[PDB]
Design a protein around this nucleic acid. Structure first.
Lengths: 209, 53, 101, 202
RNA sequence: AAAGCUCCUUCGACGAGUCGAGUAGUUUGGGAAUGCUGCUCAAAAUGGGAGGUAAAUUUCUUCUAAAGCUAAAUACCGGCC
RNA sequence: GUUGACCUCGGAUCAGGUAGGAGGACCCGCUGAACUUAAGCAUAUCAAUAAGCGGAGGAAAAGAAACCAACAGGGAUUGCCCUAGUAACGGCGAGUGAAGCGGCAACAGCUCAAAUUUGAAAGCUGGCUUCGGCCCGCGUUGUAAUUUGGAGAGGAUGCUU
């Protein structure tokens, strides 16, 4: 029953909503539990970091197309290029993505650089102390300052390419021959008429011959 | 009975240095098993086939 | 191999310029490919089991007859137009080989 | 190798060879009980494909179902409701005859677990199914790690909870834009969409 | 004895009364029909499904169903504190 | 004729085992209303809810794509914020109403059928044993190793574990 000028109401309170009301009165309490779990996890993994290396990835829509972010795992082709055994990779903390594939060559190049400088920064204790092997650490460059986050030490350096640059005058290029607004209009109309134009051309050639 | 003694015989031969395939010989036996026999005739290795009814 | 992109959106070949590459074929895309062992089995079983009722009807309809009834009948029985075409074209082969035989 | 030929032959359920064979075997049934033991599978390939093995502890049962739609059980025809739901005589059950068949056999054999089931024969007024069951208390089962996952107290009577292959079908458990309202459980997502959440700092 | 890596002429088996279609009822925001179930018909090998408007012709993209297992982030004061 | 096997169906207070009931706040299914709103009322709404029935655990369920997209492409499942009171449904009335992308919590991958070990059923329940083995039985209408699409099999070649 409207009485004055108001906005037409629509409040979806017509079922028995009172039977399903969730209140978050334990927001601080949960936080404490999560922190206790992290410390326990950190103590179990004594000298290793907590997280696992992720690759660099570009967002998948036309919007958000500009930014980059972390992925889920490295593709099988990326691992082979860096020279890493397929099965040893998960053990030493590098992840693996069963179902991603590389179409271009910049993401491929970016990720192999990531692996290469990681392997240079990786220590590797032997499986038994009394018998070291050839691929282990020689026990003398084995004491150094370590990291544990591996998200801050290996996060995206810059998601968005630098906003602006500077160039000397008389080096600025020239636009498209006729304008840059006529270029868009022409490129649009061409795709609108692709079907009709090709059909008309084809009929004339066959009919004449 | 024959298999157990045969495996014992070749075991006592491997312990003085002589390798296997020297006390025994190539065996000739009949073949059986439904899928097994199908392979033997798919490969054109069989000579006669007897089927139950 | 792959064509290049024009470098401006809202066009006939829009995109952002990059160097597309060719990538080796995945073993998951060879699904519906003919293999030289399955064909042996199917030929043997076909000659052991024989034909089906609706199959026999379209044979006699196809031979010594026109062809629009055959396609209409096959679709009504099989369900879709695409499968009907394939069955008729394959079925034509078996009758044709017998005549040549 | 021969098992491949069997798969290819059983696909042609209309050829004269196959059609005659079913006609005789279906008479063999319908003279026995509605539920009874089977000494060995009648479709060895279809049984092997579903996990059946040949070793002590695996059993095969055979069952018959009434077939046809479900009539609403109500005294005479009265429903005492609104006209939008007062039909009685064209309604359909919301599960498959396979599930009903599996459930009855499970109640019969209360000390085994139900693995799967498959179709064997069919008439105007009956449908015949064969059910594969496993013994969870046999030592030969507890020894093998490919199956002993079923001996855990969380897989009790899963036929009647909807966890076999036919049960997963009659629920909407598949990925994609098509199975939206039932991907993770119809009741669960209804609760999620219909709850009202309030935080401390609104 | 068993295992891992680099190269190759050539091979490379992959789930049926199921998929799909017609029809009826129910349900969903799903609209020439989103899922489920009953009845009738009932497939194929570069095949098959999907690409949110029914149909024909010609291209393209992405996966590989009809067999199975597995902790954590989530719900709850019914039980013991 | 006698004798000895096989297949199917039975008896036994035979040897050894297993399920029912309770609880049901939370979870997985089936079946299934009306009061009420529409200022009347039948489609609609209350509601894919209450009552009834079946089945488990400390969590349950789901899960390693027959996915989303139309990008310079993402990559198991679960949960919170946002998308969004939006696309859409509706005597187009009252009303109802999702999903992709994005940030975070937590992260973990795998096994079977379809192949002939065929130069040797290499496999397993039970009973007895002194612990080394033996006996009957299951099983060739297929029990172990090998392979699961990321591949793999078959060939060379030199390293490493």
């Amino acid at each position: 029953a409207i009485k004055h000028n108001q906005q037409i109401p629509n409040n979806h309170f017509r079922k028995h909503w009172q039977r399903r009301v969730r209140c978050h009165f334990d927001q601080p309490g949960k936080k404490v539990t999560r922190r206790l779990a992290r410390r326990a996890k950190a103590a179990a993994l004594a000298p290793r970091p907590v997280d696992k290396l992720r690759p660099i990835v570009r967002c998948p829509t036309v919007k958000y197309n500009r930014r980059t972010r972390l992925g889920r795992g490295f593709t099988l082709e990326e691992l082979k290029a860096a020279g890493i055994p397929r099965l040893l990779a998960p053990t030493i903390g590098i992840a693996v993505d069963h179902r991603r594939k590389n179409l271009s060559e910049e993401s491929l190049a970016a990720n192999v650089q990531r692996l290469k400088d990681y392997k240079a920064r990786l220590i590797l204790f032997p499986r038994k102390s009394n018998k070291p092997k050839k691929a282990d650490t020689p026990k003398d460059q084995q004491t150094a300052e370590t990291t544990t986050s591996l998200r801050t030490s290996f996060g995206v350096e810059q998601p968005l390419a630098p906003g602006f640059t500077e160039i000397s005058k008389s080096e600025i290029p020239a636009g498209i021959e006729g304008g840059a607004y006529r270029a868009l209009r022409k490129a649009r109309s061409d795709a609108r008429l692709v079907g009709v134009r090709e059909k008309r051309a084809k009929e004339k050639a066959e009919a004449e011959a | 009975q024959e298999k157990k003694e045969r495996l014992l015989r070749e075991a006592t031969a491997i312990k003085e240095g002589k390798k296997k395939e020297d006390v025994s010989k190539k065996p000739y036996t009949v073949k059986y098993g439904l899928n097994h026999v199908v392979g033997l005739i798919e490969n054109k290795k069989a000579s006669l086939v007897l089927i139950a009814n | 191999a792959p064509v290049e992109r024009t470098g401006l959106i809202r066009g006939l070949n829009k995109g952002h310029k990059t160097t597309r590459r060719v990538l080796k074929e995945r073993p998951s895309r060879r699904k519906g490919a003919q293999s030289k062992r399955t064909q042996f089995v199917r030929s043997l079983i076909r000659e052991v089991a024989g034909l089906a009722p609706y199959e026999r009807r379209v044979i006699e309809l196809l031979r010594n007859g026109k062809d629009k009834r055959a396609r209409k009948f096959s679709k009504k029985k099989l369900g879709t137009f695409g499968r009907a075409k394939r069955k008729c074209e394959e079925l034509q082969r078996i009758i044709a080989e017998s005549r040549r035989a | 190798g021969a098992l491949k030929y069997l798969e290819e032959l059983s696909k042609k359920k209309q050829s004269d060879v196959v059609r005659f064979l079913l006609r005789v075997r279906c008479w063999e049934y319908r003279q026995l009980n509605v539920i009874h033991r089977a000494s060995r599978p009648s479709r060895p390939d279809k049984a092997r494909r579903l996990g059946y093995k040949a070793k002590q502890g695996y059993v095969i049962y055979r069952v018959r179902v009434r077939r046809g739609g479900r009539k609403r059980p109500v005294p005479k025809g009265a429903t005492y409701g609104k006209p939008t739901n007062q039909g009685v005589n064209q309604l359909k059950y919301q599960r498959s005859l396979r599930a009903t068949a599996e459930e009855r056999v499970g109640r019969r054999c209360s000390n085994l677990r139900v693995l799967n089931s498959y179709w064997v024969n069919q008439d105007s007024t009956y449908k015949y199914y064969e059910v594969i069951l496993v013994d969870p208390n046999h030592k030969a089962i507890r020894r093998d790690p490919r199956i002993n996952w079923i001996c855990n107290p969380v897989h009790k009577h899963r036929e009647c909870r909807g966890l076999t292959s036919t049960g997963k079908k009659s629920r909407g458990l598949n990925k994609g834009h098509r199975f939206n309202k039932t991907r993770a459980g119809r009741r669960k997502t209804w609760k999620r969409h219909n709850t009202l959440s309030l935080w401390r700092y609104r």
